[PDB]
From a paper:
Transcription activator-like (TAL) effectors specifically bind to double stranded (ds) DNA through a central domain of tandem repeats. Each TAL effector (TALE) repeat comprises 33–35 amino acids and recognizes one specific DNA base through a highly variable residue at a fixed position in the repeat. The crystal structures of TAL effector (TALE) proteins bound to their respective target DNAs have revealed that the residue at position 13 is the only one directly involved in DNA base recognition, whereas the 12th residue stabilizes the proper loop conformation. dHax3, an engineered TALE protein, proved to be a useful scaffold for structural characterizations. We then present fifteen crystal structures of engineered dHax3 variants in complex with target DNA molecules, which elucidate the structural basis for the recognition of bases adenine (A) and guanine (G) by reported or uncharacterized TALE codes.
Numbering used by the authors: 231 to 723
Write the structure that this text describes.
DNA sequence: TGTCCCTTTATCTCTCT
DNA sequence: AGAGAGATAAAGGGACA
């Protein structure tokens, strides 16, 4: 019989009990732990079920699942219960930060290393705990933290990096690799190719940073004489997750895309300069003719869909859904292109297909409003949130649907919608802001932290902002959100 | 196999004017 | 508003006990 049979059965037995108290895990959650944490993780969750959710730690199920669904999740679980008290009291971290550290492959290692190295990294190297956390909050955090301790001096002193830059580089998967690669390649990339430290840091500061730097060093000469590319364009291709793949694919497919489809190199760089550029390019080479056939979509329109993270996913999904969205849902081809020309355009298209008739019929929105909500990064999130929150926001909070749509129609709109519903009463009732003012603050990218900034200043006032009126603070918050308020604080000082 | 670490891709959010 | 950066997650491979 098949070997994995016993283990699979074990998985399913134990899994069925976790649908019960104190955890109440759904199928989605249970499957997730099985795939990544394995069977030992699922058994550990059950084993530790009461101990985790109850006092002391008082973790939510989500947090328990977040910790459990990685390699070694059994180990992270045992360690969290051991070290969350220690790190919260002896180092002053919040439980959320502890969970974040725990929620990665080898979580036990990161947590233990943070427990061992946080004092030395703050006292002798002047890092903040938040910086120590960020370094530790990726696979191999243990490696990254140790490598930061070893190399912060020689990176700041012998190579001229600020600690901020070193932290930025370190704070990715394989962080240890990017650090070590920057020690070796920084002089070479700067002195031989005239790259700034800043540019090298941008290349280094992604997952697989080491891979992109070495590939930059290799392909920069070939790309800058044989293809008409500037260093700046190369840097932009490489300064993304999997920049190595993106670069090799730009050498491969630039001439092909140009000659065969009439694209400019500028258009090719744009496609390559997003996470998964390789995937986007190869998908363009294969789908552009298909999309453009019979006076269909223009090239320009295809290039735009391609020119976002996961543009491959966006492209393929357009090709599948362009017919059904236009025919059965009444959307113009131009509208479909707009929904898809953002990160996660695939997700947004699928969510418009699913939710457009519902939001129109059940909530009284127009397809134009639905398109506008969808036409941002995380559009799926904004659309799903409008569906959930329109009734409470309108009925209980006084908002017009037109205002709810305005809040949802920016990157992170789901975050803004949730924050308005959460902070509108205290902001209006307890401090005399008008709803229109709250909506105005929230109808911008970064709507959430802008609203949180305001509530903070009105509930635990910084003197540094006391000269500003509520209306001025509002005017500021609409202008530049949280950053603007924070900048204004620094100025007073 | 369980655990740790690294790399690529996709998606979501906030910044920076 | 569009480009850049950072965050969070899913999934696969190498490594080794």
């Amino acid at each position: 019989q098949w070997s994995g049979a016993r283990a699979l059965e074990a998985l399913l037995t134990v899994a069925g009990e976790l649908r019960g108290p104190p955890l109440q895990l759904d199928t989605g959650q249970l499957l997730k732990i099985a795939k990544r944490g394995g069977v030992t993780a699922v058994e550990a969750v059950h084993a530790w079920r009461n101990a985790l959710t109850g006092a002391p730690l008082n973790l939510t199920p989500e947090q328990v699942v977040a910790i459990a669904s990685h390699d070694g999740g059994k180990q992270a679980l045992e360690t969290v219960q051991r070290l969350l008290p220690v790190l919260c009291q002896a180092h002053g971290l919040t439980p959320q930060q502890v969970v974040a550290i725990a929620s990665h492959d080898g979580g036990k290692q990161a947590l233990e290393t943070v427990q061992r190295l946080l004092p030395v990294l703050c006292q002798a190297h002047g890092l903040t705990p938040e910086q120590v956390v960020a370094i530790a909050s990726h696979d191999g955090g243990k490696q990254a933290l140790e490598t930061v301790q070893a190399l912060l001096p020689v990176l700041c002193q012998a190579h001229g990096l600020t600690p901020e830059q070193v932290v930025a580089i370190a704070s990715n998967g394989g962080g240890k690799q990017a650090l070590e690669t920057v020690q070796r390649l920084l002089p070479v990339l700067c002195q031989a190719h005239g790259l700034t430290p800043q540019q090298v840091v941008a290349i280094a500061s992604n997952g697989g940073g080491k891979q992109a730097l070495e590939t930059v060093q290799r392909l920069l000469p070939v790309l800058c004489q044989a293809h008409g590319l500037t260093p700046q364009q190369v840097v932009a291709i490489a300064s993304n997750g999997g920049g190595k793949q993106a670069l090799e694919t730009v050498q491969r497919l630039l001439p092909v895309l140009c000659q065969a489809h009439g694209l400019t190199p500028q258009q090719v760089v744009a496609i390559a300069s997003n996470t998964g550029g390789k995937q986007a390019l190869e998908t363009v080479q294969r789908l552009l003719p298909v999309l453009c056939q019979a006076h269909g979509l223009t090239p320009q329109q295809v290039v735009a869909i391609a020119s976002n993270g996961g543009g491959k996913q966006a492209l393929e999904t357009v090709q599948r859904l362009l017919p059904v969205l236009c025919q059965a849902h009444g959307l113009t081809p131009q509208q479909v292109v707009a929904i898809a020309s953002h990160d996660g355009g695939k997700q947004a298209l699928e969510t418009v297909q699913r939710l457009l008739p519902v939001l129109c019929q059940a909530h009284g929105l127009t397809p134009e409003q639905v398109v506008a909500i969808a036409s941002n990064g995380g559009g799926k999130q904004a659309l799903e949130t409008v569906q959930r929150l329109l009734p409470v926001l309108c009925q209980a909070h006084g908002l017009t649907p037109e205002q709810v749509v305005a809040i949802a129609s920016h990157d992170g709109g789901k975050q803004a919608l949730e924050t308005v519903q959460r902070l509108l009463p205290v902001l209006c009732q307890a401090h005399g802001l008008t709803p229109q003012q709250v909506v105005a603050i929230a109808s911008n990218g970064g709507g959430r932290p802008a609203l949180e900034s305001i509530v903070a200043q009105l509930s635990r006032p910084d003197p540094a902002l006391a000269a500003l009126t509520n209306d001025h603070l509002v005017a500021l918050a609409c202008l530049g959100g949280r950053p603007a308020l924070d900048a204004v604080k620094k100025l007073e000082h």
